[PDB]
Amino acid sequence: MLTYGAPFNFPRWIDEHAHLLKPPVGNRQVWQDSDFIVTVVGGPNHRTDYHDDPLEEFFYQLRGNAYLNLWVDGRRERADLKEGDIFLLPPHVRHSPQRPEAGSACLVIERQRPAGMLDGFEWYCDACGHLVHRVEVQLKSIVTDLPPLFESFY
Ligand SMILES: [Fe+2]
DSSP: OOTTOOOOOHHHHHHTTGGGSSTTTOEEESSSSOSEEEEEEESSBOOOOEEEOSSOEEEEEEESOEEEEEEETTEEEEEEEOTTOEEEEOTTOEEEEEBOOTTOEEEEEEEOOOTTOOEEEEEEOTTTOOEEEEEEEOOSSTTTSSHHHHHTTO
């Protein structure tokens, strides 16, 4: 049979999950236990961490707008994700995804990292532009391997 089920209307499925696409949660993963981690991410949410992902991430901004703060060539650059945009982020490229809008929704796709492949999270000094903290973490379930990880800084 079909491990990950039938095809379904995306719009509807998004609408039926609007409640789940804003705080305290924000995001909602479409299929469970897939190599391809396919998620919709909502708003609003802002964050202070930069993600260094050892695999690429694919983004598609189905509704409203957002942006990525990026650490490029030792410089604090930014990438708009207006409504409509797609984008393929390289691995290890440092990114902080900012979703201001209530009712925005972005498709985000990623691979389960294999055992040995680590993610990094890091925060940066707004002043002296220097790396303040960095964790490396073996990601496996992106709701258990993250909320503590986040809270021992704030
Ligand atoms: Fe990320």
